[PDB]
């Protein structure tokens, strides 16, 4: 049940797709692992806040409202998830 290498679950073509949404034409080989690391750091910060919320809420299920508040505290406020 333990998971080990799901940062590679965010695939290389998914990175290419996102950069196409970002409007990036040419992408170096060094890009993908750096993107994986920085998204890992960003997710770690957000869910650290969310887990703090959840244990402060005495809950076990991660809710999207906690995601919303965590993104608010990082100045990345998201519309469209019950906020």
């Amino acid at each position: 049940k333990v998971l080990r290498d799901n940062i590679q679950g965010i695939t290389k073509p998914a990175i290419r797709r996102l950069a196409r949404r970002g409007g990036v034409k040419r992408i170096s080989g060094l890009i993908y692992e750096e993107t994986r690391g920085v998204l890992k750091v960003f997710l770690e910060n957000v869910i650290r806040d969310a887990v703090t919320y959840t244990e402060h809420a005495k809950r076990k299920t991660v809710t999207a409202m906690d995601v919303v508040y965590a993104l608010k505290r990082q100045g990345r406020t998201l519309y469209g998830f019950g906020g």
């Binding site: 998201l78 519309y79 906020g83």
Partner: protein
């Protein structure tokens, strides 16, 4: 048995059909609208609380809200909002 969850659906529906009678809507667009109305509401409310604190005011009035509008809401939208709000408090005092 269920518990009611309040949302701003019918009002945005009303003003949409007021300004565009022929225009439809999707529900997740309404989720983005609910997020918008709560977000801007809390921005204005926090700024109004700040202004009440700064000038030692225990009461937040329309002057506080208008001040918060000139602060947060930029430029042309602020002047329009001032205009219809002045109309709105005027007709409200007449009502």
């Amino acid at each position: 048995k269920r518990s009611r969850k309040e949302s701003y659906s019918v009002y945005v529906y009303k003003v949409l059909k007021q300004v565009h009678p022929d225009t439809g809507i999707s529900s997740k667009a309404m989720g983005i609208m609910n997020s918008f109305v709560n977000d801007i509401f809390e921005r204005i409310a926090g700024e109004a609380s700040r202004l009440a604190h700064y000038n030692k005011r225990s009461t937040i009035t329309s002057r506080e809200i208008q001040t918060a509008v000139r602060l947060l809401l930029p430029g042309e939208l602020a002047k329009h909002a001032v205009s219809e709000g002045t109309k709105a408090v005027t007709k409200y005092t007449s009502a």
